[PDB]
Ligand binder design. Structure first.
Ligand code: ZN
Ligand code: ZN
Ligand code: ZN
Ligand code: ZN
Lengths: 175, 175, 175, 175
């Protein structure tokens, strides 16, 4: 039967690299492997498919596919949850990777529900760019200073950066 | 600084035992440790506190407490999330344990949000009572047969049982 | 088929508690479970067997046993390795728990070989009794002071204690 | 202070990829990172150093290096163990990756001792090329058939291959 593996953590934790590592094990086992993302060994290669909408997944013929990866799952909405549940019901090994929290430390839909329903959950940590300890947050900086709680995701002409930080060095500025 | 560790999995996965194991490490380190639950080494013992409401946690003086456990967190509502966030902000190591899903395979509030915000997440599996493989679900049986999707949690006079099952042997009957 | 799971770590890491947790999953799956150590749910209970010698394991009829635990494996010599390999070959789930290192930080036979050959390996950490960080060592103290590199395991009339410590607070005194 | 992380598993388990993933977290934290192997982000890149002998490690000036990777550690002998112990004593985060067992299922020196002494140990599994279950072994095939227990590592003109297999599909032929 099928199952779901969930890979999560902050922006700099290497989630996507870990997803690919797991998928490449499929290749060496002579399995057919695909990875969906927001838009090789002895002849066997990961088939990568760029998508704009979660619903696109079901338009592909996956009957002969053993392992299905889905990267950056926070890009999609709650629809991806039932898709993943159906795929694993159908007998596929499904591996999903995405952010646990945004820059504000707010949970990123739909990872919470995916973590709750998945057979396996791995939360990867990064390393704090301030102190070098294990980190769990992503610090957004705008013009050198911590982003404010109500700063929009998209800006025009702003100097901005992201870095991994531990809880102790993560700052969300007041609105 | 503080952090949150999340222990989750099905009813028969040993979540509570794992919570206690982690807390007892605190004891051997000569830390002060408490565990809250829904209602010892060289003199140092886990202080267990039975509570009916999440809000009770904040009525206790925890200033000198190093490690705070909270068991069966699915008993509480979303209020427990900000409490846990505050406690870890305050510098405590907070360890929460609770169910990931109910008998229907539906996510059990508030574990999804807690998993999303926690530094560490461990999903424990049990062993399937049918086939002996790793299990992730809890099968509810009423009068020998799989519970229906819309069966109430409380019954009068029903023969009922729970057992660990893998996805392949977990059955939710139609309504 | 069978496999071997290895649980290791320092004296105060809760290895034995973790072993029991895993074994109790067997019970809830209605499996027959035994645990060997150096010398219950719905009728199904862990059968505990106290032994002086590794060779005793093979004198017991284990044909109907699903899960075999062996605690404190550092008590036994290298003979336990082939026994464990045979048991897992025979189709048993074998779970072994024991110390990784002694008070000197020296590897404790036969755990290194067992870790190398096992399908799964879990190294548990404790909490440092000095600083509260994750610990990997056991500090032996004799008359208040770090034990010396060539201090014997057995003493007469000595004041001695053990506590968990991180590498940074673990001290082995010169001979 | 420093510590040692050990990454192990069979030939097709992705050990080297996991090593690189961990090292790249160092980069994003603005740490100085090097990787030794048997013979980039915002200006910061992993410095890779090809070596023939473990003793070469100590001829490099590592005083300003935060994280030290060592890949394919089974290439080196027991000398690498004290080198790694010294480096971690010196305050470095040391990450070692290497094979747990050879094609015969025999422990590969010096990984057993490294696993015993390290703070963290991760054994990665691959996927069985026969049955698709989790695998822990590497099957060596010579002229289509399982390699014999006493077949040499080096051959002239032999058709040979390696594939990941579970214990149940791993075969070592009699001598
Ligand atoms: Zn920090
Ligand atoms: Zn089953
Ligand atoms: Zn310490
Ligand atoms: Zn197989």
């Amino acid at each position: 039967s099928g199952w779901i593996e969930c890979i999560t953590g902050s922006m700099f934790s290497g989630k996507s690299e870990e997803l690919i590592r797991r998928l490449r094990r499929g290749i060496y086992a002579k399995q057919k492997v695909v990875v969906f993302k927001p838009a090789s060994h002895n002849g066997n290669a990961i088939e990568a498919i760029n998508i704009s909408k979660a619903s696109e997944i079901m338009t592909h013929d996956l009957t002969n596919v053993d392992v299905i990866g889905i990267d950056e799952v926070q890009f999609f909405d709650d629809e991806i949850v039932s898709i993943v549940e159906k795929l694993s019901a159908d007998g596929h090994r499904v591996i999903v990777a995405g952010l646990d929290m945004d820059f504000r430390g707010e949970p990123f839909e739909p990872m919470p529900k995916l973590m709750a329903v998945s057979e396996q959950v791995t939360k990867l940590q990064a390393v704090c760019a301030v102190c070098g300890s294990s980190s769990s947050r992503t610090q957004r900086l705008i013009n050198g200073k911590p982003a404010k709680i109500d700063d929009p995701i998209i800006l025009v002409g702003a100097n901005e950066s992201y870095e991994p930080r531990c809880r102790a060095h993560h700052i969300v500025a007041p609105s």
